[PDB]
Short mmCIF file of C-alpha atoms in Angstrom, two decimals:
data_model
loop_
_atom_site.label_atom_id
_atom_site.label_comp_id
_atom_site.label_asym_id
_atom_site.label_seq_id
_atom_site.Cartn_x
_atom_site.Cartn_y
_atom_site.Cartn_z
CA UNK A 65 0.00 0.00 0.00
CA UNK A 66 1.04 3.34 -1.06
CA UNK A 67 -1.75 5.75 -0.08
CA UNK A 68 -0.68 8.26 3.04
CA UNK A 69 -2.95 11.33 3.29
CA UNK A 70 -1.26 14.02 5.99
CA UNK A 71 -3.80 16.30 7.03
CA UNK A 72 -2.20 19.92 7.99
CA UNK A 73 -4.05 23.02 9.92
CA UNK A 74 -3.83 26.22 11.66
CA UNK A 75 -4.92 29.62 12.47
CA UNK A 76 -1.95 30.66 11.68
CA UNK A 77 -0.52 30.29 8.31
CA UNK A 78 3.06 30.97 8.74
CA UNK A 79 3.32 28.14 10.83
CA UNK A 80 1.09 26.18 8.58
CA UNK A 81 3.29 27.31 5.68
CA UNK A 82 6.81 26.17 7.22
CA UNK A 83 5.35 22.90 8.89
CA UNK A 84 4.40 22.37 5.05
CA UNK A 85 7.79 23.01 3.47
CA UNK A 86 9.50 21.05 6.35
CA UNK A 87 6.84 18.26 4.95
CA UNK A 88 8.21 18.98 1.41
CA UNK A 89 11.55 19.06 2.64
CA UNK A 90 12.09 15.62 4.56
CA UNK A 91 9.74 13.68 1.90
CA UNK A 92 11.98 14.83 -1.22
CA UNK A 93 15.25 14.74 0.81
CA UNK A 94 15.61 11.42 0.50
CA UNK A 95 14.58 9.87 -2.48
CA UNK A 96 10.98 10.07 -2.85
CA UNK A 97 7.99 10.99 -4.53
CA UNK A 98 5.08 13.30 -3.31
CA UNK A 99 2.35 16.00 -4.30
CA UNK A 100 2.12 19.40 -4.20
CA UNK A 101 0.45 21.07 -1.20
CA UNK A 102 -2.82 20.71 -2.02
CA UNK A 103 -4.43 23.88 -0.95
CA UNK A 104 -8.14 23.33 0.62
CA UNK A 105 -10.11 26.52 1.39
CA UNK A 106 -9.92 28.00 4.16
CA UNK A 107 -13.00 28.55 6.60
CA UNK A 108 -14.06 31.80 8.16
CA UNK A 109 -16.21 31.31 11.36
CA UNK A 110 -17.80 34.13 11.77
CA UNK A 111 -19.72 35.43 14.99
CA UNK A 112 -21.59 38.80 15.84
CA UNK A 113 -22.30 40.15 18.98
CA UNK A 114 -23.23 43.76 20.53
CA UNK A 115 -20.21 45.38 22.30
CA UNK A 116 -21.90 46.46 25.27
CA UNK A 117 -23.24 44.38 27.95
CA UNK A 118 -26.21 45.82 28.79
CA UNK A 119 -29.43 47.20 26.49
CA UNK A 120 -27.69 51.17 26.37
CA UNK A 121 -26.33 52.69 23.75
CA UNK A 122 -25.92 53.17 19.84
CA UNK A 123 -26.47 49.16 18.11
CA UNK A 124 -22.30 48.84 18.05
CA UNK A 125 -21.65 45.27 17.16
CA UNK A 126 -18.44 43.27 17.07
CA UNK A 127 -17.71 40.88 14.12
CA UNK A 128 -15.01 38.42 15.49
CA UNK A 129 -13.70 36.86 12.61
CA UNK A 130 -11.91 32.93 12.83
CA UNK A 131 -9.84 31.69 9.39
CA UNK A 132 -8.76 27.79 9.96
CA UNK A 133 -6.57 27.01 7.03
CA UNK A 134 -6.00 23.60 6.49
CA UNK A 135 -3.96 21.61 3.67
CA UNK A 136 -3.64 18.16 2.51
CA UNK A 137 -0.97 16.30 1.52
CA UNK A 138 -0.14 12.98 -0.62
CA UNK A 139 2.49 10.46 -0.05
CA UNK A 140 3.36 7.16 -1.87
CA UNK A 141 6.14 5.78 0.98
CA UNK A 142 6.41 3.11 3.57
CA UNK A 143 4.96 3.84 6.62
CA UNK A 144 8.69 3.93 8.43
CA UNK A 145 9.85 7.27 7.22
CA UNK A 146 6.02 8.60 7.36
CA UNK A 147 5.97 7.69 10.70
CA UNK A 148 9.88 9.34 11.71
CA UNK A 149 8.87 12.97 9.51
CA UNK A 150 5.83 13.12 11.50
CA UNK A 151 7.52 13.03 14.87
CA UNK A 152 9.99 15.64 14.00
CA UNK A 153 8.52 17.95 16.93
CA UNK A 154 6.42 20.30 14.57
CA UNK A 155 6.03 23.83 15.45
CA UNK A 156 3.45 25.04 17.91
CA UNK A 157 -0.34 25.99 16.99
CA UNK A 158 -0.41 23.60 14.05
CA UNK A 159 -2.82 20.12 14.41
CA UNK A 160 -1.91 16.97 12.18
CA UNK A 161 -3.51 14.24 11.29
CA UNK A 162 -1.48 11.70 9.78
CA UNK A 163 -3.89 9.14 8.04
CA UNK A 164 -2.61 5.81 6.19
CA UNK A 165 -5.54 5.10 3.54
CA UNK B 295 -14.91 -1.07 82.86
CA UNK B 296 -15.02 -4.43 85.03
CA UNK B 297 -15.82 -7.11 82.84
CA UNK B 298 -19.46 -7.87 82.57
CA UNK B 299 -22.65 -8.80 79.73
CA UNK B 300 -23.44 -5.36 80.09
CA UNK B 301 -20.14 -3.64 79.19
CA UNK B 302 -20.27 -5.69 76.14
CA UNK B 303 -24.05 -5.27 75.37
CA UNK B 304 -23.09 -1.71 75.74
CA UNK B 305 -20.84 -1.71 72.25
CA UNK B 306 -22.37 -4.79 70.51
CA UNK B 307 -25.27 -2.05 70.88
CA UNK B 308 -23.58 1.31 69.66
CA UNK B 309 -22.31 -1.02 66.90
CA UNK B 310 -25.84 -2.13 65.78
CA UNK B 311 -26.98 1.47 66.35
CA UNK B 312 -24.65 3.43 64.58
CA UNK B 313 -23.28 1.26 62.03
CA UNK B 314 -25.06 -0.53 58.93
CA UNK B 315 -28.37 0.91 59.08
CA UNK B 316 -30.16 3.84 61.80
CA UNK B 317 -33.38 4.11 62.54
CA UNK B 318 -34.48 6.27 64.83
CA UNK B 319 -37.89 6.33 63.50
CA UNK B 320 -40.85 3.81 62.95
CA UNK B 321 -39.42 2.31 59.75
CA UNK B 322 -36.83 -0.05 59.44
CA UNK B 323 -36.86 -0.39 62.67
CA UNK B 324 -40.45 -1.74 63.20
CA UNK B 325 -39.54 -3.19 59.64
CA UNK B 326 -36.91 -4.60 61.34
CA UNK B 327 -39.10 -5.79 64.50
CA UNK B 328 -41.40 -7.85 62.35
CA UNK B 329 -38.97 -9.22 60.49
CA UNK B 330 -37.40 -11.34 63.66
CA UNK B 331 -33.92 -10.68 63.41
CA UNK B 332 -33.26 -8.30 66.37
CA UNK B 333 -31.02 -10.34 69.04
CA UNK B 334 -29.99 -8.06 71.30
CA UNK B 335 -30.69 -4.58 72.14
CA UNK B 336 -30.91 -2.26 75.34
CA UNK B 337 -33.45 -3.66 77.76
CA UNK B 338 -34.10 -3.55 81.60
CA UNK B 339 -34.46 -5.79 84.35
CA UNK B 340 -37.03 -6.67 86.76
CA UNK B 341 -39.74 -5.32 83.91
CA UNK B 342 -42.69 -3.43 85.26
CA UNK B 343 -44.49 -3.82 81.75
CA UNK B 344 -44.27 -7.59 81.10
CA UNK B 345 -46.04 -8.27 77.82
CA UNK B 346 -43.87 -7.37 75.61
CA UNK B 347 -40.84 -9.05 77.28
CA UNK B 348 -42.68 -12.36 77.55
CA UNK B 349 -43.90 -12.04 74.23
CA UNK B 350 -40.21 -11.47 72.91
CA UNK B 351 -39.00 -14.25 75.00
CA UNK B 352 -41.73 -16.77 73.89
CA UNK B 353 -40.82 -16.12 69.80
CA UNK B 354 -36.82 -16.12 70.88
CA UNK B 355 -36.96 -19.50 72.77
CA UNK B 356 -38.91 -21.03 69.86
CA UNK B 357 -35.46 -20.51 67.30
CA UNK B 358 -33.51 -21.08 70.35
CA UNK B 359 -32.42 -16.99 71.40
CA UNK B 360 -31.83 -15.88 74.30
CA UNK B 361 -31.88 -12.20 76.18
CA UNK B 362 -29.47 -10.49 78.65
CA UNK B 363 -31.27 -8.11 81.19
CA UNK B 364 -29.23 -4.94 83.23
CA UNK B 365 -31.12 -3.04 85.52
CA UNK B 366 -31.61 1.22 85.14
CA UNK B 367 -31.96 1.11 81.16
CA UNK B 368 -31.99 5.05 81.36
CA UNK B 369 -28.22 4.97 81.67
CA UNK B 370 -27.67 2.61 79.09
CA UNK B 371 -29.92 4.57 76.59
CA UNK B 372 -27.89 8.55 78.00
CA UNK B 373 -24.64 6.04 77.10
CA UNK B 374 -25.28 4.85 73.25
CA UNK B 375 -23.72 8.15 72.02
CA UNK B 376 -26.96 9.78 71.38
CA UNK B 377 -26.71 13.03 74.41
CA UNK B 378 -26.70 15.80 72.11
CA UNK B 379 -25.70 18.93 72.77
CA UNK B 380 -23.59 18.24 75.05
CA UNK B 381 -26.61 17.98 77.72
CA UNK B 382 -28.61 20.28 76.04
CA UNK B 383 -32.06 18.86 74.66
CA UNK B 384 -31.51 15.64 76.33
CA UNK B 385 -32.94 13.11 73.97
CA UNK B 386 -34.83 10.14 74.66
CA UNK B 387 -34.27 7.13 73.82
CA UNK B 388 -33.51 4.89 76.75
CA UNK B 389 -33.71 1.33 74.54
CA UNK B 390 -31.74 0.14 71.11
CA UNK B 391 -31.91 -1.61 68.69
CA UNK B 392 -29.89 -4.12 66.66
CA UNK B 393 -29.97 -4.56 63.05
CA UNK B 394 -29.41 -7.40 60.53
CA UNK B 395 -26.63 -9.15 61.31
CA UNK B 396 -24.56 -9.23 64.06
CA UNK B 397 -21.14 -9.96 62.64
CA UNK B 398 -19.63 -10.96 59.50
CA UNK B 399 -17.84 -13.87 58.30
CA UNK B 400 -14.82 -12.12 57.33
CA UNK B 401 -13.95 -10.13 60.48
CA UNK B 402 -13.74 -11.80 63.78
CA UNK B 403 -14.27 -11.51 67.39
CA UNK B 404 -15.05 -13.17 70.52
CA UNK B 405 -17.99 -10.78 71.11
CA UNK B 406 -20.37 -12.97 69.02
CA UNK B 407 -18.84 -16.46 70.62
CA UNK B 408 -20.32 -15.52 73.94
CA UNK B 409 -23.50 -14.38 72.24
CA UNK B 410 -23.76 -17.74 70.87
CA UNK B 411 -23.22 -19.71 73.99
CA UNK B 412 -25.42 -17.82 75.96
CA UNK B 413 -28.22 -18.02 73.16
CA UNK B 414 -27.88 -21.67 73.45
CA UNK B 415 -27.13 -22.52 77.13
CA UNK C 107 -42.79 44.15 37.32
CA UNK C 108 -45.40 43.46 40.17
CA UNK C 109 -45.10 40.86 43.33
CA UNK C 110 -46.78 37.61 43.62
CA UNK C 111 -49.88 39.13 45.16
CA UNK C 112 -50.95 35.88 46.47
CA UNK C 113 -51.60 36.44 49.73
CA UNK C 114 -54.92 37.64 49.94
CA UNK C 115 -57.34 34.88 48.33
CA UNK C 116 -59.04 31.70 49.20
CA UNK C 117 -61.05 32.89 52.22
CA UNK C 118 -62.85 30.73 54.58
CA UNK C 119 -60.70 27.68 53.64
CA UNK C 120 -58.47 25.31 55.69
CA UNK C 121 -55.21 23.04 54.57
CA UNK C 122 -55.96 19.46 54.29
CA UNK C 123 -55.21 18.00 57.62
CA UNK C 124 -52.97 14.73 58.41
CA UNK C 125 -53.55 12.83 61.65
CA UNK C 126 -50.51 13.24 63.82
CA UNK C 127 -49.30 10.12 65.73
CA UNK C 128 -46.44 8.68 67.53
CA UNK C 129 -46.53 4.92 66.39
CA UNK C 130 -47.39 2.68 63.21
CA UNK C 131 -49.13 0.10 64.96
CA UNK C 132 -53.00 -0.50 63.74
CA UNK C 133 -51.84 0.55 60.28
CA UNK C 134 -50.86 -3.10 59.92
CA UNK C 135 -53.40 -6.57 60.79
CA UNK C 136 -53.20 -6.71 64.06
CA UNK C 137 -56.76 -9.00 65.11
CA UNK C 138 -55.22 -12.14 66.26
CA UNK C 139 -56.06 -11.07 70.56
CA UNK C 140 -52.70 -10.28 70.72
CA UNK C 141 -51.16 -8.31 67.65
CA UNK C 142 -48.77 -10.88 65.86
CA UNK C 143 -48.87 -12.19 62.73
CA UNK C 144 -50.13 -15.48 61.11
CA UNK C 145 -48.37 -17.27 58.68
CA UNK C 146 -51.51 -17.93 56.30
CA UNK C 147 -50.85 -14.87 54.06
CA UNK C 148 -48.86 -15.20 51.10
CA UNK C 149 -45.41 -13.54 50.59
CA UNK C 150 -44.95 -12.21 46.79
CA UNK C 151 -42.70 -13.88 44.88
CA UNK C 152 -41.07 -10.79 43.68
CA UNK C 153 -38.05 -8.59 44.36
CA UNK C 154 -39.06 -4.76 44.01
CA UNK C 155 -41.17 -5.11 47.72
CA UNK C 156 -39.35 -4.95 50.31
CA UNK C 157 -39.48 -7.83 53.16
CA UNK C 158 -40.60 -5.66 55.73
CA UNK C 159 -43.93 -4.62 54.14
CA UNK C 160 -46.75 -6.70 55.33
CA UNK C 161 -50.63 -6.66 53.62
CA UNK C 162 -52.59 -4.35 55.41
CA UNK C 163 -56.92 -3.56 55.15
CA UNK C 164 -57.54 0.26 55.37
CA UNK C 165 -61.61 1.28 54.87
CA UNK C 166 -60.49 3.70 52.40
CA UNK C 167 -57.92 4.55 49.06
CA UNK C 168 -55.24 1.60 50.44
CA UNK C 169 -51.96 1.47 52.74
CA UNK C 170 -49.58 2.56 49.83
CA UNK C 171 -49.00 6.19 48.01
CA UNK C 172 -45.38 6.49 46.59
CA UNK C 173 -46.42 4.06 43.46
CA UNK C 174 -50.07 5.00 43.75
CA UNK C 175 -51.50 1.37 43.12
CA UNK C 176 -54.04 -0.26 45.07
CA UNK C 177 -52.87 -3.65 46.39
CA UNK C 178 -55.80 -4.71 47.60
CA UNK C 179 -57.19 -7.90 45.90
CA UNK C 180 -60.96 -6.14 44.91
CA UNK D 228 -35.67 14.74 51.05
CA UNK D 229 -33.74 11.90 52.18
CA UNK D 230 -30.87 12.07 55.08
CA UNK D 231 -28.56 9.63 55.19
CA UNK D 232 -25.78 8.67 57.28
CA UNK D 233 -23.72 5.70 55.79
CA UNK D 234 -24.01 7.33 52.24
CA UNK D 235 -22.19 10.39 53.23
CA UNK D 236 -19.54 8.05 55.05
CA UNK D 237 -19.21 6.43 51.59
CA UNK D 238 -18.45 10.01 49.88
CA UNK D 239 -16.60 10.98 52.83
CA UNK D 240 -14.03 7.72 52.18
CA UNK D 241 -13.87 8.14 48.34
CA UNK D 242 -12.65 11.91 49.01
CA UNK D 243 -10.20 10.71 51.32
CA UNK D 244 -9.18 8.21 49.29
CA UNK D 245 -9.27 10.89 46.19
CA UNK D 246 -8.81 14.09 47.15
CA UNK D 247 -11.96 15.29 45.33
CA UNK D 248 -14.90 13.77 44.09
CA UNK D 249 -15.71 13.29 40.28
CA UNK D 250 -19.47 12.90 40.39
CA UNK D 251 -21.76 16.01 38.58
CA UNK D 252 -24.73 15.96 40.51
CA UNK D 253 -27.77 18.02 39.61
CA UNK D 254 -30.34 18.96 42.44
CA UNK D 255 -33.07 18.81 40.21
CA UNK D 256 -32.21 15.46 39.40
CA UNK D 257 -31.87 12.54 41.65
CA UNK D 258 -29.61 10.64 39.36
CA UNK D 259 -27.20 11.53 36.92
CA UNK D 260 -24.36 9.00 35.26
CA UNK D 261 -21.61 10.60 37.44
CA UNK D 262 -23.69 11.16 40.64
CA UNK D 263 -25.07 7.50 40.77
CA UNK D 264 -23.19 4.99 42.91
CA UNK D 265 -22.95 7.73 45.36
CA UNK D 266 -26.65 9.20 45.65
CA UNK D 267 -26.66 11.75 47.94
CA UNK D 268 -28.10 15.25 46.39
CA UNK D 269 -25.66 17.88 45.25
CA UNK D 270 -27.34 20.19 48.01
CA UNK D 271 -26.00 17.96 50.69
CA UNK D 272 -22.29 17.94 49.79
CA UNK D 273 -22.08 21.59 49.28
CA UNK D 274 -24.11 22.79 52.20
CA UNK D 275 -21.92 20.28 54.33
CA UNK D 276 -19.23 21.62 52.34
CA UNK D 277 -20.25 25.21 53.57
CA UNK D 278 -20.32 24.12 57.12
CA UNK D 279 -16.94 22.63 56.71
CA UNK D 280 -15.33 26.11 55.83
CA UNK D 281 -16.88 27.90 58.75
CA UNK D 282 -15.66 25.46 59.94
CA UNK D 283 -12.62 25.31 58.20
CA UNK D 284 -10.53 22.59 57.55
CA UNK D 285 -9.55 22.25 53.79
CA UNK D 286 -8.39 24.15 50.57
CA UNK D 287 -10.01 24.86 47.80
CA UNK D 288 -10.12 26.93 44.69
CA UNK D 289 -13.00 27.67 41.91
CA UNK D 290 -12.74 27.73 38.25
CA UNK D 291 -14.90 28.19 34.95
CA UNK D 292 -18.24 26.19 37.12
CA UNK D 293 -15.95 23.78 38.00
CA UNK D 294 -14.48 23.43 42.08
CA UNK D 295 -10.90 21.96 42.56
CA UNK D 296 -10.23 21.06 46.17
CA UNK D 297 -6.89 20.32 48.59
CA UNK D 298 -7.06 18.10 51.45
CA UNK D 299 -4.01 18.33 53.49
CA UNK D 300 -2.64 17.18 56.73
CA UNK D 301 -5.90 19.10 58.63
CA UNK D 302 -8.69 17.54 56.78
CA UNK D 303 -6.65 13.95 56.61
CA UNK D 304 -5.94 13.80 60.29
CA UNK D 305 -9.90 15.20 60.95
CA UNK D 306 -11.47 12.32 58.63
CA UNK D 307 -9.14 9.99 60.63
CA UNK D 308 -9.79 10.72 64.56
CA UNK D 309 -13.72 11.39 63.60
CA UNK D 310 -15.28 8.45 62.10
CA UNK D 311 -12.46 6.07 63.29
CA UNK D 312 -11.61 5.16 60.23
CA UNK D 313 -7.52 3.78 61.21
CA UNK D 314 -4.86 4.50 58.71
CA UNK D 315 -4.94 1.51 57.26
CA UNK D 316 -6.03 3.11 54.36
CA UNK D 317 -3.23 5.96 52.53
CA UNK D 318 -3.93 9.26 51.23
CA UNK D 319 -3.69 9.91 47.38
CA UNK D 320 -2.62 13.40 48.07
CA UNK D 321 0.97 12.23 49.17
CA UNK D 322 1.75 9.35 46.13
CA UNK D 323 4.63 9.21 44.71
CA UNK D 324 7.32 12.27 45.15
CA UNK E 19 -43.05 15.93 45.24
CA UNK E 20 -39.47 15.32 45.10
CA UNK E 21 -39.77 12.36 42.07
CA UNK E 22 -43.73 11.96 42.26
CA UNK E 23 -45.25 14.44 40.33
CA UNK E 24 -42.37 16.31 38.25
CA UNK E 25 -40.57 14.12 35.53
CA UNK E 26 -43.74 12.60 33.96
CA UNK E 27 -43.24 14.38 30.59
CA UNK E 28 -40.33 15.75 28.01
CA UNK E 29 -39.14 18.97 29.40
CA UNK E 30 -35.70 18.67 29.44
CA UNK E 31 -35.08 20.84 26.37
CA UNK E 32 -36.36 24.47 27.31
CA UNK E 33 -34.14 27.42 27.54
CA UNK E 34 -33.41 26.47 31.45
CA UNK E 35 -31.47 23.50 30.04
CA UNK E 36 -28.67 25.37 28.93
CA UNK E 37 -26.44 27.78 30.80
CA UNK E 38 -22.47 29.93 30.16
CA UNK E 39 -20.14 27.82 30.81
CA UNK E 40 -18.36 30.59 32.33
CA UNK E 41 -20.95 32.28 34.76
CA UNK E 42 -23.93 29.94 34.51
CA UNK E 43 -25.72 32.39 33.44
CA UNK E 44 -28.72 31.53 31.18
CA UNK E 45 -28.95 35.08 29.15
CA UNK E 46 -27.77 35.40 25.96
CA UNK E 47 -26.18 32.62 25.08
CA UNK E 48 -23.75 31.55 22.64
CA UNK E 49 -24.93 27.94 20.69
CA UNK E 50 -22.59 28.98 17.67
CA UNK E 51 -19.28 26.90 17.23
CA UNK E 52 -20.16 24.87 20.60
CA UNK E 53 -18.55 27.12 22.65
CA UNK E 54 -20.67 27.85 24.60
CA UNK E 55 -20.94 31.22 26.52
CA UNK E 56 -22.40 34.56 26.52
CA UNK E 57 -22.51 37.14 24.73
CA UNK E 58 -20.06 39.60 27.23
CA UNK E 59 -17.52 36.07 28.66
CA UNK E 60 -17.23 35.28 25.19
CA UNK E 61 -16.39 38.80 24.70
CA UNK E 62 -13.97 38.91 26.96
CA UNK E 63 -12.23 35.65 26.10
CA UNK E 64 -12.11 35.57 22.03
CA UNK E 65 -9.05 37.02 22.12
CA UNK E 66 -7.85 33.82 23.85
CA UNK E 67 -9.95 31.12 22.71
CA UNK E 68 -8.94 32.14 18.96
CA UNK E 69 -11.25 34.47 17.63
CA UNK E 70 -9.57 38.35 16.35
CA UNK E 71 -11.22 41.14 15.61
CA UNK E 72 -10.38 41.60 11.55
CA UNK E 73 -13.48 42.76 9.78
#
């Protein structure tokens, strides 16, 4: 079997961008294929609510805005060296899920 | 203190009282008084109301049980823990009751030896 | 907004009244000249009643409440 | 509503045995997944908790509806000389180092 | 009273079902997202929890 899927996502997407070329990185190091970072769009949870905390005052509201950017990638490899690049103590804020299909 | 039926009757009581199962009301203790397995509890001697003492002597000799009788139950009921308040409010309750029971299999004594022995001679 | 306001209704009418007694002695059948029990009355075969309970004849409604079922045979 | 004794012996060993106790219990309720086991109504522990602080035996803190207590030496030598319970059994405050 | 009367229908749904998770306070409640809270805890905590003021 040669079907890995390596679910990436943050808030943040610097992080999200550098845990994705260190990704890149280790798989092409050695010799090995794998796709490009596919690019899934990114969700904006959005939520409304008055500023004030009572019933006073002009209708001021707050929009709090929430952008989860999240990227998967492909990888035709035995599980060994999927399983040493994803402990490689990735950087903070990002979530993985490492999935052998 | 000194060695007697009484100053055992006087924890095998509190035991029965305080531990594994209270009643200080009509149910399960009347629950408990129908159901014939009180053995021992706080009583008095030379009874001045003698129905209920023949009556509970009658159905304890007929499955072989036997009663131990110490004069002035008033102190016996003041010592079973129950004076609360300090003094203050003074409750009454000047008899026990014993619960289902007496003693396990798995812990042992020679409280319920000398029950025993007395029960049956 | 405004209080409960009940306060002032219901004239010329009385709580529902409860006997008050000390012991639970009649409440049970107690006609055999001395108040002990026979052993002609069945014991039901079934674990949700506690062992304690005994049958009991009240003229009215029935000796029960928490359930409200009649255990009377009718 | 229902008083107990041997019940609130029962909780009283599993929070010497614990620390705290991990059972929500709803008043409104009488039985909830966490609460069962040890049935005694929310209202009781807390109001005997209440009576315990002005009192005042054990530590505590609050957080986000949630309570987080400390039972030290106090409350451990207090649950032991009260309901003669002997030391057979060890506090889990003090495992390991 | 205590279990005799109540619990002999559905009404564990209504609005008193649900309270902040914060405050316990039933008034104004946030369902969105799952988080849970009201409108001014929420407020005060979407800096933290994740949620920045962009629009």
């Amino acid at each position: 079997i040669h079907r890995i899927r390596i679910t990436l996502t943050s808030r943040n997407v610097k992080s999200l961008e550098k845990v994705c070329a260190d990704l890149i990185r280790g798989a092409k190091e050695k010799n090995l294929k794998v796709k490009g970072p596919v690019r899934m769009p990114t969700k904006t949870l959005r939520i409304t609510t008055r500023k004030t905390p009572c019933g006073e005052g002009s209708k001021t509201w707050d929009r709090f805005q929430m952008r989860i950017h999240k990227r998967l990638i492909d990888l035709h490899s035995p599980s060994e060296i999927v399983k040493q690049i994803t402990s490689i103590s990735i950087e903070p804020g990002v979530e993985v899920e490492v999935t052998i299909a | 203190g000194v060695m007697d039926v009484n100053t055992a009757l006087q924890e095998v009581l509190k035991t029965a009282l305080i531990h594994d199962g209270l009643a200080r009301g009509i149910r399960e203790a009347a629950k408990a008084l129908d159901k014939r397995q009180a053995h021992l509890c706080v009583l008095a001697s030379n009874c001045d109301e003698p129905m209920y003492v023949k009556l509970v002597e009658a159905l304890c000799a007929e499955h072989q049980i036997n009663l131990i009788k110490v004069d002035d139950n008033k102190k016996l009921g003041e010592w079973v823990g129950l004076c609360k308040i300090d003094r203050e409010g003074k409750p009454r309750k000047v008899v026990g009751c014993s619960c289902v029971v007496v003693k396990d299999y798995g812990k042992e004594s020679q409280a319920k030896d000398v029950i025993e022995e007395y029960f049956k001679c | 907004k405004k209080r409960k306001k009940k306060s002032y209704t219901t004239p010329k009418k009385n709580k529902h009244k409860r006997k008050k007694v000390k012991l639970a002695v009649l409440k049970y059948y107690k006609v055999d000249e001395n108040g002990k029990i026979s052993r002609l009355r069945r014991e039901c075969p079934s674990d949700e009643c506690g062992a304690g309970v005994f049958m009991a004849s009240h003229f009215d409604r029935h000796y029960c409440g928490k359930c409200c079922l009649t255990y009377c045979f009718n | 509503m229902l008083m107990p004794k041997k019940n609130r012996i029962a909780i009283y060993e599993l929070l010497f045995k614990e620390g705290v106790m991990v059972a929500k219990k709803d008043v409104h309720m009488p039985k909830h997944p966490e609460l069962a086991d040890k049935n005694v109504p929310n209202l009781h522990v807390m109001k005997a908790m209440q009576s315990l602080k002005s009192r005042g035996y054990v530590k505590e803190q609050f957080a986000w509806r949630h309570f987080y207590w400390y039972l030290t030496n106090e409350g451990i030598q207090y649950l032991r000389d009260y309901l003669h319970l002997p030391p057979e059994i060890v506090p889990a405050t003090l495992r390991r180092s | 009273g205590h279990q005799q009367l109540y619990w002999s229908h559905p009404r564990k749904f209504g609005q008193g079902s649900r309270s902040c998770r914060v405050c316990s306070n039933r008034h104004g409640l946030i369902r969105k997202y799952g988080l849970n809270m009201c409108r001014q805890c929420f407020r005060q905590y979407a800096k933290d929890i994740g949620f920045i003021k962009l629009d």
